[PDB]
Design a protein around this ligand. Structure first.
Ligand SMILES: [Mg+2]
Ligand SMILES: [Mg+2]
Ligand SMILES: [Mg+2]
Ligand SMILES: [Mg+2]
Ligand SMILES: [Mg+2]
Ligand SMILES: [Mg+2]
Ligand SMILES: [Mg+2]
Ligand SMILES: [Mg+2]
Ligand SMILES: [Mg+2]
Ligand SMILES: [Mg+2]
Ligand SMILES: [Mg+2]
Ligand SMILES: [Mg+2]
Ligand SMILES: [Mg+2]
Ligand SMILES: [Mg+2]
Ligand SMILES: [Mg+2]
Ligand SMILES: [Mg+2]
Ligand SMILES: [Mg+2]
Ligand SMILES: [Mg+2]
Ligand SMILES: [Mg+2]
Ligand SMILES: [Mg+2]
Ligand SMILES: [Mg+2]
Ligand SMILES: [Mg+2]
Ligand SMILES: [Mg+2]
Ligand SMILES: [Mg+2]
Ligand SMILES: [Mg+2]
Ligand SMILES: [Mg+2]
Ligand SMILES: [Mg+2]
Ligand SMILES: [Mg+2]
Ligand SMILES: [Mg+2]
Ligand SMILES: [Mg+2]
Ligand SMILES: [Mg+2]
Ligand SMILES: [Mg+2]
Ligand SMILES: [Mg+2]
Ligand SMILES: [Mg+2]
Ligand SMILES: [Mg+2]
Ligand SMILES: [Mg+2]
Ligand SMILES: [Mg+2]
Ligand SMILES: [Mg+2]
Ligand SMILES: [Mg+2]
Ligand SMILES: [Zn+2]
Lengths: 135, 50, 59, 51, 86, 122, 134, 158
RNA sequence: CGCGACCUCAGAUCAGACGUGGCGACCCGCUGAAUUUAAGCAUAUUAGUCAGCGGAGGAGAAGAAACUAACCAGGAUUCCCUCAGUAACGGCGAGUGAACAGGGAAGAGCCCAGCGCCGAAUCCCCGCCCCGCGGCGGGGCGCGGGACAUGUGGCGUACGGAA
RNA sequence: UAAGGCUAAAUACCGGCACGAGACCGAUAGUCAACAAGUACCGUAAGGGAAAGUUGAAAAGAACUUUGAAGAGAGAGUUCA
RNA sequence: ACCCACCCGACCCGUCUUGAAACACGGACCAAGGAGUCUAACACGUGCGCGAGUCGGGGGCUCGCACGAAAGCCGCCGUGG
RNA sequence: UGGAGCCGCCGCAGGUGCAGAUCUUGGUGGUAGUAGCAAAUAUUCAAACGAGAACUUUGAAGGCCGAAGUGGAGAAGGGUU
RNA sequence: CGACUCUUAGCGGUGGAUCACUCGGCUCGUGCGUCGAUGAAGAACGCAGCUAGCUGCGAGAAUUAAUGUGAAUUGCAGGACACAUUGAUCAUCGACACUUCGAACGCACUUGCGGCCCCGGGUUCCUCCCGGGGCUACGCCUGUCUGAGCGUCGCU
C-alpha cells in the first residue's frame, strides 16, 4: 500500500484524515508499471501490459510498447491510430486497460458516477447551475 | 568592486548607457509626449538591479 | 581602435595587418566601461604611426 | 453579474392581446395624432394602398 | 543591535542573476534560482500567485518565433514558393 | 550609384564578392569620417552602404541556397536547412499516402456495400 | 444603414483606424475632389492629392480662387501645404498653413502613367455602374 | 432564523456555485449554428432525406408509456430478413439498423416489416453511373424528382 | 582447442528516426486540505473543492452493453429539458442526493486475439532504371540483407463464422 | 457476454489569433495598467507594485525695444480668446 | 437675501445608553468616492392573460440579424411541470 | 464666466442622494515664521576671480588629527562615483 | 479712520473638484483553434546620422529580398532617384537571414577547459602556432558493426 507521506505522522487537521497507514492508492500496481515504462520510453507509446509474477515485495509486469514512427506500424492501417498524437501517453491519462479500471467506468447501474466521460465530468454537470436565459 | 566578472561589467555598462538624458530634438517631434527621461538613475540614491 | 569585443589579440593583429598593409608589433586590449573593446596597436618600428594615421583618415 | 436576470418572458396570449390593442389604435386617428404622427391630410385611417 | 547597527555588516550577498530568467534570484550557496528553478529542467510556476504567472507568459516577451508562426498559419503555412513575379 | 537586387542575380559569384568588399571598405572609411566630423553628406551614406551590403549579402545567400536545393532535389536524405519547416507537429503528421491506406478488408466493404444515392416518395 | 457584419460603426474603432492608419491608406484618406471642369472630362469625382497638383482652397480663411500648386503633403499630419497658403511667424519667416485635402479642390492634376491609369479605372467602373442602372 | 410558518427548505448553495454557473447567452447563436450545419447536411446529401435514415416503429417500455409508440434506434435483423434486405445493404439505402433488438411479439415484427416493404416501394434508388443497370430506378422517377423529404421519413403516428 | 549455430547481454560521434521544455480557458489521470456550516465540537459539512504533481487535443474524455427493464418491452456514447430537490444517504442534524423510463440535439459504426484453412501467401531496409517529387510516393528490376513459424499477411469475431 | 482494441457527430472553452456588439464604465471610474506599465520604486528572495489623459482650428509657441547677473518682469506682437 | 445693532431665547453634533453639553467614544478643514445588492428557493399581498385548465421550456420552422442574438409561428402545444 | 452640447413630458432600467464609519484617495489650515539647524578646542588678516563672497581659490598667522591618524594603500560593497 | 480680528462681496492666488471630451477598459457574442532539438516560451546583449525609453529588428540588426501599392519620409539634417522607372513610401510576406544564454546539447558556467575530421596563412604533412569550417547531450526505436558469457547445443 501507499502510506501517506507526511513528516512523522503529523497529518495536521481534523481527526478523520489522521490516517497515515492503512490507506490505498487509486491506480493499481500494473498501472504504475505501465506508467513508469511509458515515462522512461517517451518516444514509445504504451499499448498494454501483463502480469508475469510476484514475490512478496514485488510485482512484475511486461508492458507492450510501440515505436510510433517505424514504418511497419505507421504504414499498416490497423495500427496507425497509435501514431496519431492524441494517443500520446495513454498510460499517463488513464487509457491503457489497466489504467482505465481505476477511473471506474462501465455501463449500467453500478456506475452513475462517470456518466459523462468520467468521474470529474459527472460531478461537473451535476454542480453546474444551469441558469437559463428566461428562467 | 574591481574584481568584476565580465557578465557584471557588461550589465553595468548597459546601465550607464541608458542613464543619459533625452535628446532635445525629440521634443519637436510631431506626436511627442515625453519631456524628460524619468527612468534616470543616480548612484547615490537608488542602487541598481543588484 | 575600437574593436568587436569578441576579438582576441590574434584576430586584431591579423585584421589590422590585412587592411592596412601594415605589420604590428603588439596588440594590447582593454574593455571600456561601455561595451567597447579598445585595442592599442603598436606598429613595428620600420613603419610610422603618424603616416599610417593620415593614410586611414584620422589626424 | 452576468447571471442577473436580464431577459423576461411573457405569455403568448397576452403578447397577442397587446398586438391587437396596438393594431386597433392604429385606427382611431385621435390616438395616432396624440402619438404625434402628423396625419392631417391622410385620407382614411386604416390607410391601405394598392399592391 | 538587532537593528541599525547590524545593517552595517551587509557586506556580502546571497543571490545573483539567473541565466534562464534574468532575475536577481539565483542562490549561490543553493545553486538554484527561486523564480524559475534554473538548473531544474522545468520552469517553476505556481498556481497560487496568478500575478506572478502573468508577469511572464508567452505574450510577455518578444515572441520572435511564435508571432511569425501566427502570421504564417493565417495565410496557410505555405512553403518554398513565391508570388508571381513581374 | 544605386545597387539594385535586379541586376546582381545574374552576375558571377566572384564579381559579387568584390562588390561587397568594395562596400565593406567604404563603410569603414565612413565610420572613421563619422568620428572625425567628416560631413553630414557622408553620414547619410553610412545607412545606404549598409543596406547595399545587406542586399549583396542576401542575393549571394539566395543564389547559393537555390543551388543547394537544386542539387538535393530528388535526394532522399537532405539537410535540415533544406527540409521543409511547417511546424513540429505538422511534420509528424501521417505521410499523405499512409493516412489513406485502407486495409484489404475495408476495400472489400467499399466494393460490395457502397453508399447509394437515393430519395423518397415515388 | 450598413449590413455587412465585418465593418464597424463604432466611434472608437473608426477613429483608431483613421488615426493609426498607415501612409498608403492615408493616400486614400487624403483624397480631394476634382473641379467641375475635370469632373466632366475624366468622369471621376475625386483623386488622392499629390505633391504638385494645382489647387483651389475652398473653406477656411485662405478660401479663394487663387490656383496654387501643392507644395507638400504631410501624411503624418493629414494635411497639405499649398504654394501661397502661408502665414508669417513673429520673427518674419513664412510658414505653410496646413490645409486639409477635403477642403480643397484639384484644378490641374499632375498626370503620369500611373495616375492616368487610375483615372481610367475610375471612369471605367463608373460607366459599368451607369450601364447596370440603365 | 425561521419566522412563523413557511416551508423549511434546504437550498443547495453551500459549495462554490458561483464558480460554475452556466449562462445561456449562447443559446440563440447555438440555435443558429446548429441550424446552419443542419441546412448544410441537407445540401450535402442532395436527394436523400434530410431527416436521415428510415427508423422503425417501436413501443416504449414500462406500464406508463406502454401505450405510446416511438421511433426506434434501427430495424432489427428479423425484420430485415423477412422484408428481404441484406443487413449490410440496409445501411446504404437509408435504413437504420440496430441489431441488438430482440423481437418477441409477432405483431411488431410484421409492423416493421410492413414499413420496410412500404419504404423500398416509395424509394427512388439512383444508379451508380448515369448509365443505368438493374435496381436503380427509371429516368421518369428521377427527373420528376431528385427531391428530398423534409421531416422524418414515414412519420410514426400513434 | 579451434571453427560454427543460436540465447542472453554489452559497446559505438555506427545509418536513419523519434522523446525531451512551454502554454495551460477547456479536457483526462492522480494527489488533496483547512477556513466554513452544524449557532459549541469530534462523524458529517466545506469537497474529491483551493493549493500540489502528471499527460493531452482542437477539442478532450466517453462509446458500440457482462445495458436498461420486468413493459404489449426498449437498444453504443455524449448533450439539453424533464425526472427531482425525488428514491437514497445523514450525530436520519445541519446538510447531502442520483438513476431508468418520456421528449429533444446528434446520430455511425467497427477491428483483433482465439478456433481454422491457405508452400509466409507478410513486413522492414538496401542498390539500379522510368515517372513523381516543399505532407518521400508509384512502377519495374537485383541469388542484395534482415524481420518473421516463440507466428506475419488474407479470410473471419459473436449481429454468428468456415467449408 | 466481462478480464483486447479503434470510432466522427451534437458538447466544452476567463489561454491564443482575428472580428462584431453592448439600456456597461467614463480617468479616485473602467483591467494593476487610456500615458515609455507589470513601468518607476520597494524587498536578499518568493514577491509586492504606483502615480500619471485635455494649449490651440492652425505653433500662429510671443520677432523687436527696455529693466535686471539671471529667474523674473514692462512694453510690442499671435490668436475669436 | 449682505452687513451691523439691541431685547428675549439658546450647551455640540454623531452614537451606544434606563440617563450624554458631559470629566463617555468618533469628528482640524475641504473635494471626490463610500454601505441592504444580485441569483436561487419559499411565503403572503397586489396587477394582468387565460380558466379545469394553464404553461413554455427545451427543441424546431421562418434570414445575410442593420435594428434581431429580437419578433413571429409550431398534431412538437405538450414529452414534461 | 465658459466654449459644445442639453433638456421637459410618458414609460423602462439602476453601480441613484453622505457629516460622521480612528472610513478610501487627493488637497489645505491653525499650530508657526514656532521646535529647530548646540557631540568631537579655531578661527583670523590680505589678495584674486567674480553681478554678488562669513563659506571658493592663492599667500600669511593661529590651530587641530598627532603614525592603534583626520596620513598613505587594498578586500567586500559600490558602479562611473 | 489708526494695528488686529470677524463678516460679507469684488478682484488676485492656492488647489485641481466639476462639466464636456476618449486611439482604454469591462462585459456578451462569432469564426478559426497554430509553439518547441529545422532550437519554443522567456531571458540577455546588441543594432538609428543625430535616439534615452517605448516599440522594431539580429553583425544582412529602426531591417535584405519578393509581391501589391504608386511619391514620399519628415524633428533637423542629408541625400537619392529621372516617380514615361522593378519605382519613394507604405502594406503584405512565399525567398533569404536570424549574436549569446535558455528543454539547451562537447565538458564546464569562470565565458573556464577541451577532443576528433576538413581548409587558408604557417608548413612545403613538421609538427607546432594562429584563424576558419564541420562534428562531439541524455533517453529511446528499427537496422549495422565489433564484442562478451564453466548460457544452450553442433562439427572437430
Ligand atoms: Mg470531518
Ligand atoms: Mg483488478
Ligand atoms: Mg547607500
Ligand atoms: Mg484481417
Ligand atoms: Mg432529428
Ligand atoms: Mg462551529
Ligand atoms: Mg457562530
Ligand atoms: Mg470553534
Ligand atoms: Mg464529500
Ligand atoms: Mg488544482
Ligand atoms: Mg507537454
Ligand atoms: Mg477520443
Ligand atoms: Mg468493449
Ligand atoms: Mg416537481
Ligand atoms: Mg457530497
Ligand atoms: Mg493469424
Ligand atoms: Mg477510446
Ligand atoms: Mg486613472
Ligand atoms: Mg487622474
Ligand atoms: Mg485608474
Ligand atoms: Mg475629470
Ligand atoms: Mg487638443
Ligand atoms: Mg486640467
Ligand atoms: Mg474663451
Ligand atoms: Mg450605563
Ligand atoms: Mg461629568
Ligand atoms: Mg467605544
Ligand atoms: Mg479624537
Ligand atoms: Mg459624494
Ligand atoms: Mg397572485
Ligand atoms: Mg473644441
Ligand atoms: Mg449604471
Ligand atoms: Mg465629506
Ligand atoms: Mg526661533
Ligand atoms: Mg587631543
Ligand atoms: Mg589615498
Ligand atoms: Mg584611510
Ligand atoms: Mg481635470
Ligand atoms: Mg488628478
Ligand atoms: Zn531563475
Amino acid at each position: 500500500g501507499r502510506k501517506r507521506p507526511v513528516p512523522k505522522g503529523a497529518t495536521y487537521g481534523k481527526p478523520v484524515h489522521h490516517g497515515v497507514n492503512q490507506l490505498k492508492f487509486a491506480r493499481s500496481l500494473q498501472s504504475v508499471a505501465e506508467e513508469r515504462a511509458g515515462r522512461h520510453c517517451g518516444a514509445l507509446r504504451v499499448l498494454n501490459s501483463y502480469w508475469v509474477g510476484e514475490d512478496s515485495t514485488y510485482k512484475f509486469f511486461e508492458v507492450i510498447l510501440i515505436d510510433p514512427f517505424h514504418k511497419a506500424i505507421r504504414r499498416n492501417p490497423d495500427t496507425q491510430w497509435i501514431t496519431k498524437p492524441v494517443h500520446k501517453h495513454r498510460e499517463m491519462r488513464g487509457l491503457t486497460s489497466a489504467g482505465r479500471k481505476s477511473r471506474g467506468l462501465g455501463k449500467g447501474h453500478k456506475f452513475h458516477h462517470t456518466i459523462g466521460g468520467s468521474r470529474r465530468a459527472a460531478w461537473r454537470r451535476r454542480n453546474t447551475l444551469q441558469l437559463h436565459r428566461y428562467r | 568592486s574591481s574584481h568584476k566578472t565580465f557578465r557584471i561589467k557588461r550589465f553595468l555598462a548597459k546601465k550607464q548607457k541608458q542613464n543619459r538624458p533625452i535628446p532635445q530634438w525629440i521634443r519637436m517631434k510631431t506626436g511627442n509626449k515625453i519631456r524628460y527621461n524619468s527612468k534616470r538613475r543616480h548612484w547615490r540614491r537608488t542602487k541598481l538591479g543588484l | 581602435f575600437i574593436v568587436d569585443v569578441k576579438a582576441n589579440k590574434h584576430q586584431i593583429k591579423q585584421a589590422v595587418k590585412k587592411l592596412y598593409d601594415i605589420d604590428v608589433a603588439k596588440v594590447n586590449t582593454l574593455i571600456r566601461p561601455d561595451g567597447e573593446k579598445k585595442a592599442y596597436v603598436r606598429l613595428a618600428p620600420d613603419y610610422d604611426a603618424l603616416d599610417v594615421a593620415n593614410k586611414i583618415g584620422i589626424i | 453579474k452576468t447571471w442577473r436576470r436580464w431577459h423576461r418572458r411573457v405569455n403568448t396570449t397576452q403578447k397577442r392581446y397587446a398586438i391587437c390593442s396596438a393594431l386597433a389604435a392604429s385606427a382611431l386617428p385621435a390616438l395616432v395624432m396624440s402619438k404625434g404622427h402628423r396625419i392631417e391630410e391622410v385620407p382614411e385611417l386604416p390607410l391601405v394602398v394598392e399592391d | 543591535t538587532k537593528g541599525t547597527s547590524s545593517f552595517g555588516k551587509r557586506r556580502n550577498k546571497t543571490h545573483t542573476l539567473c541565466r534562464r530568467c534574468g532575475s536577481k534570484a539565483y542562490h549561490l550557496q543553493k545553486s538554484t534560482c527561486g523564480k524559475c528553478g534554473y538548473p531544474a529542467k522545468r520552469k517553476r510556476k505556481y498556481n497560487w500567485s496568478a500575478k506572478a504567472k502573468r508577469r511572464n507568459t508567452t505574450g510577455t516577451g518578444r515572441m520572435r518565433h511564435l508571432k511569425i508562426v501566427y502570421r504564417r498559419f493565417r495565410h496557410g503555412f505555405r512553403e518554398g514558393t513565391t508570388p508571381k513575379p513581374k | 550609384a544605386k545597387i539594385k537586387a535586379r541586376d546582381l542575380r545574374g552576375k558571377k559569384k566572384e564579381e559579387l564578392l568584390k562588390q561587397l568588399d568594395d562596400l565593406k571598405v567604404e563603410l569603414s572609411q565612413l565610420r572613421v569620417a563619422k568620428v572625425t566630423g567628416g560631413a553630414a553628406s557622408k553620414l547619410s551614406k553610412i545607412r545606404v552602404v549598409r543596406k547595399s551590403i545587406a542586399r549583396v549579402l542576401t542575393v549571394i545567400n539566395q543564389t547559393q541556397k537555390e543551388n543547394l536545393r537544386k542539387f538535393y532535389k530528388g535526394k532522399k536524405y537532405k539537410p535540415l536547412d533544406l527540409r521543409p519547416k511547417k511546424t513540429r507537429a505538422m511534420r509528424r503528421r501521417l505521410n499523405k499516402h499512409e493516412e489513406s491506406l485502407k486495409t484489404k478488408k475495408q476495400q472489400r466493404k467499399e466494393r460490395l456495400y457502397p453508399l447509394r444515392k437515393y430519395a423518397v416518395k415515388a | 444603414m450598413k449590413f455587412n457584419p465585418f465593418v464597424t460603426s463604432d466611434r472608437s474603432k473608426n477613429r483608431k483606424r483613421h488615426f493609426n492608419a498607415p501612409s498608403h491608406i492615408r493616400r486614400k484618406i487624403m483624397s480631394s475632389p476634382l473641379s467641375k471642369e475635370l469632373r466632366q472630362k475624366y468622369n471621376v469625382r475625386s483623386m488622392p492629392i499629390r505633391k504638385d497638383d494645382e489647387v483651389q482652397v475652398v473653406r477656411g480663411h485662405y478660401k479663394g480662387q487663387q490656383i496654387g500648386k501643392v507644395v507638400q503633403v504631410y501624411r503624418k499630419k493629414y494635411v497639405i501645404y499649398i504654394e501661397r497658403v502661408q502665414r508669417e511667424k513673429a520673427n518674419g519667416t513664412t510658414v505653410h498653413v496646413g490645409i486639409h485635402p477635403s477642403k480643397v479642390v484639384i484644378t490641374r492634376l499632375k498626370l503620369d502613367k500611373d495616375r492616368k491609369k487610375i483615372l481610367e479605372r475610375k471612369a471605367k467602373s463608373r460607366q459599368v455602374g451607369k450601364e447596370k442602372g440603365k | 432564523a425561521p419566522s412563523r410558518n413557511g416551508m423549511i427548505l434546504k437550498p443547495h448553495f453551500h459549495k462554490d456555485w458561483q464558480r460554475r454557473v452556466a449562462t445561456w447567452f449562447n443559446q440563440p447563436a447555438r440555435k443558429i449554428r446548429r441550424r446552419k450545419a443542419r441546412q448544410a447536411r441537407a445540401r450535402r446529401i442532395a436527394p436523400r432525406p434530410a431527416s436521415g435514415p428510415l427508423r422503425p416503429i417501436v413501443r416504449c417500455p414500462t406500464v406508463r408509456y406502454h401505450t405510446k409508440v416511438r421511433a426506434g434506434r434501427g430495424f432489427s435483423l428479423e425484420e430485415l430478413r423477412v422484408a428481404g434486405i441484406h443487413k449490410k445493404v440496409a445501411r446504404t439505402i437509408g435504413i437504420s439498423v440496430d441489431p441488438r433488438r430482440r423481437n418477441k411479439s409477432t405483431e411488431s415484427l410484421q409492423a416493421n416489416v410492413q414499413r420496410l416493404k412500404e419504404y423500398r416501394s416509395k424509394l427512388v434508388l439512383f444508379p451508380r453511373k448515369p448509365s443505368a443497370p438493374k435496381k436503380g430506378d427509371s429516368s421518369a422517377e428521377e427527373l420528376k424528382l431528385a427531391t428530398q423529404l423534409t421531416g422524418p421519413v414515414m412519420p410514426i403516428r400513434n
